Each structure stands twice: as structure tokens, then as C-alpha cells.
């Protein structure tokens, strides 16, 4: 079985009685405006996706994840979940109860345990292994406010979720896995439609794992990216036409990527552990500044993670062997070899090209096409 | 990587020894042997049957029957014996005799003992049945009433059209070492490669250094591939689809007994002597179960060659790949199971095998032969 990171699955969803009280006096508490990513962090805290966390890191915890990728008690935790405010936005003090607003929506109530300062260069360097402003995460770290705020939270509202019905929470996914008699579950994280390489990895894992938990991540989109609804419906087509039934589950999680590379891959595994997964597929270049095998290399420092990473050797499609192969068993030259790249396959479709069937399933392509505009913007 | 019994046997007579024995064949009694026995003689003499240096005596014959092991407990499952009738027994114990295939002296033999046997016990213990319809049972009954044990010395081989491909254990071992191979997996066959065969061999290559493909030359039936077709088809396959220094091809001559699981052990022993560390055991290796050939290896933990059993696989015409039921949901019409007999029948009937059954270049190589098949 998979135990929740830290021992118990966290739940911070405020009770209807607690929600009514706080919202009856919104204007008496200090209101702090948060970004959407922080609003998503809050729902991940409240539904146990971030177990054991019950709020935003305090100073001791924050410095510990920076220096060691572990909490003070040595439990693995690699991605700082913090709340920042500028001098002018700090309309509260330690010991105060504050309300975090996304736009005009009260997202959560927070008990301010501690207000502290930090070194943005140290923050940037230890998390992303670089302090170059060109790095997106470094830039977002420098834009942070001067003060971080720690303390336990309680969720009052979620950001509107067009895909609520797919957004199963850890308590539901765990009950579902057991519902299906799965003892081992392998997680596959993605932000793209499935191509044949992704199907190969998932079915490879099925030969020593009971089921696959495909977990599309809902986050900020870039122009040219597949619409989440396209990704969802594409996978539903893939399973119906190519997967045995009761061998896969599709559920979505919301999460704003930090692009901290190998340090973020550990965070990804922790999230999937809490969803109930015992294994986690780690692809190359997970989360320009990080090497392809860096995200696999870091797991050697966490033998106490209690979620088994799965590393796959390099494979490609050969147009002479007519099969997914690897260099050991294929003598064919570069023209015959087709390496899988979701980005290149995505660019074919944007450019009016048909992906060959060794890149994408016929029915998957026709589902993507069934959309007037599959991509954002 | 060590020969069964400890050391590689060699019973090939030196040319000075051979000549002196052939200068006056007059002195020795002549005994006419069947071709299959002549094949057994060259397998003895080139170490394919190590530790055996000749035909088994009584104590060894009975032990193989009862325990599938020699008196010293070394695994040996197939008796290698020489049979003569009362009329053919123009010799006694202690005599030196000459074994002849037609007018060719195949070997010189020192007779240790002449003993009798129970043909029904023989047939039953080896083949698990005494049904005369069983080919091996009938050939056991046609054996002469006397078996003859003793060490042999080979003087000639029956003509071999495939001599150049019939590398002996001492040269295969030197070749495995020359290619830096530490582990070697044997794949025995009597058919052309289809994509299932290639799948298995390349699967093994992911955890062994190289593959030793070993076509077995024996009696043919009407409709069988000619052995030169099989060989040329494999050299076409390797050249077009295998990396260099991952495959070796060599032939061994051997007449099947059809003893099922008991012969699979004997097959693995032969490949051990050739230098292999692993041995692929195909299903149904008539009267025996498909997994029995795999079940028997449990009783031989000391065999020192590792059997390799593979899970069921087939080609799916919707997945467009070799898969297995665990990962494929599609119904029977999309599933193509690999049968060497079905694929061979197609070619005999003038049909083109789909490329998911047989490589394009392999089929073209088979086509290059005007009469690829054996005719009665
Ligand atoms: Ca700042
Ligand atoms: Ca005697
Ligand atoms: Ca008889
Ligand atoms: Zn190839
Ligand atoms: Zn299929």
C-alpha cells in the first residue's frame, strides 16, 4: 500500500459552520491578495495533495527545504510552499487571522504563526541551482514580496475549475484504487496528448504494476499548447481503443510549475504518493539549466521516499524494424530512427500535418481534430 | 561456460592412428550402423555429448532410465546406445570393432560389455508411454536385442552438405571468447526465422551478451524447408536486422527422439558443451504438455546452464506491434499468433507472408531458391 507522505492524509477544508462565521465578518479581518498559483497551492494543501503540510512554511521549515530538501524532522520536502507580502500589503501582525483573496473570492483563512524575511539570491540559487534572471523561476522568486508568512490555513473556496468532475482528490483516488483491487499504482504526469512513446512507457509499467494513474496537470498555458479539454478527451479515446479496462484511471491536478528541475521531480513524486501511488514514472529533463538524467539522479538521495521511481532506458521507433526498439537490438541508421517528441508532434498538428501512426494513434488524432481549435489562443 | 562433466571430450582419431586401423581393416569385426548412430558418433567425438566418450554401458543405461542422471549423479537424460542383433554380434566383450555406415568406417570401438534390456521399460521410462504409434517407442522396439557399451574413436563422418556451417564445440567456444561474450543464449530451430523467433532472440540480448542460433540438421519430412534455405534466410536476417557481434550461426546434426521434456534437458546439455550459458525452451519442446519441457528443469538445479522461458505474445493488427493479453484489449480477429507451420504452409501454397510474420528480405531469400521445400 501507499502511505500518505508524513503518515496521515491532510484535510484543511473548512467546515460549513466555520466558513459561514468567517464570511459573516470578512471586512473585520485583514485581506491579503494572492496570485492564482498560490490559490492553487492552497487547494493542494487543503485536499492533502501537499501532505504533511497544513499551511505555508515557517522560517525554520523554509530554510530546511532550501538547504536539505527536507523538513526540520528530516521528512523529504523540496519545493517551498510560501506566502509573500510587500511592506504595504502587510496589514497584519503575527498572531493575526487573515483572509487570502484571489480577486474578490475569499480562498482561505490563515493563522499567521510567523512573519520573516529572506535572501532572494539564496532562495533562487538553492532551489533552481542558478540565480540567472533569465530563468523563469528565478525571475518569479525575485518578484516575490519582502516578507514570507507562515501558519496553518483552512480552505473556504476554490478557484473556479472547468474540469471539477475530473479533479479527483487524494481521498477519492485512494478509495478508487482500492475499489479496483489495485495494490501497486504507477503515476504518469503529463501536460500533452498521448503519443506512442507515452503509451509504451505506461504499458511497460503495467507488466509489473497493477494499474496506471494518468494525471494531467492543469496550469498556465502558453500559446500553441494543447487545450486541457483536448488532452482529456484524447486520453479517453486512447484508453477506450487501446487499453484493457480496469488498468487505468484519469484524474487531473492543478499546480503551477516552478521549473526547478530535479528538485521539482521529488515534489511531483510526493504529490503522487499522497494520491495513493506506489510508483512514479520519471521522464528525461523533468521540470537549459538541468541535464536530462538529473531528475533521475536526485532520487538516490531519497531512499526513504516510500514511492518507487521508474526510470526507462532510451527507445525510438525504427522504420525498418517496424517497432519501438533500442540501440542494443537495432543496427539501422539515423534516417530509419524516429525519436518521440511531444513538441514536434504538436508542431505537426499546428502546421496542418498528419502525424504518422507510429507517432500517434489514428483515433487519438481524429479526436484532437474533432476540435475547431485544439490549441490555446 | 564449462563443458558438462568438467572437460570437453575429443574422440577424433589422429591420422596416424586412423591409418594404422584402416591399413588392415581385415583384423577387426565389422558392424553396420544406422545413419543416426553415425551422427551420434560424431557428436560423441567432438564433445557435443560430453562427458560421454562412447556408448553407455548397462549401469549407466539403467541410471539414465531411472533418474535421468549418470551413476555419478551427473545429469544425462537421453541414452546414447549401440544395438546389434544376434546375427550382427560377430564380436565379444574386449574386442575392438569397426562401425561402418555403408562401406565407410565411421569409428573404432573397444567393447566393454554386451547386455540385454526390457524394451517396454526402455520405451516407457524415456517416452512416458508404450504406445507403438509414438515414433520413439516404435524405433525403440526396432532396436537390436543387445546393447553395446565402450569408448569410441571417430575415423569418418557421414557426408555433410553443411560442413562449413557445422562448427564444433571447441571452435564455438573459441569464437564466443574471441567476441568477448561472457553469457551466450542458445536458440535451436529447424525452420526459417519469423518475427516471433527474432522477438525472442532480441529479448534475450537485453540480458545476455550474444545469441547462438543453432539449426539442427536431421531427417526431413515432405514440406519442410531445405536446410540451405534455413541457413541463408538467417544470414539474411542477421545482415539486415541484427547488430554485428550479437549473433553466431552454426549447425549441429542430431536425430530427434521425441522424448519431450526429457529431451529438452539433453538439448540444454548439448548447448552447454557448445559454450552457452542460457537456453531458450520453446513450448511443446503429441503425448507431452506444452509447459512440461519447462517444468522438468526444476529437478536439475546443478545443470549450470540457465533455461529461459518466455511469456505468451502475439502480433496485434490494431496495436501494430507484438504485445500480450495483459496490455492489449483487442478481440481475436486482430490477434496473429506466431506459427512456423502456418507461415510455412502459406509459402508452399504460393502466398506472400505479411511483414508482421516474416521480414521482407527473408522472404526474398527463400524465393531465390527454385525448390525451397523437401519432396518425398
Ligand atoms: Ca522582491
Ligand atoms: Ca559382461
Ligand atoms: Ca527389438
Ligand atoms: Zn531497426
Ligand atoms: Zn491490441
Residue numbers in the entry:
A (entry chain A): 2 to 288, 292 to 381
B (entry chain B): 3 to 287, 292 to 382
According to the publication:
Similar to many thermophilic bacteria and archaea, the domain III contains a zinc-binding domain (320–343) that might contribute to thermal stability. All residues critical for the reaction are conserved in MtATPS, arguing for a conserved reaction mechanism.
Here we use physiological, biochemical and structural analyses to provide a snapshot of the complete sulfate reduction pathway of this methanogenic archaeon.
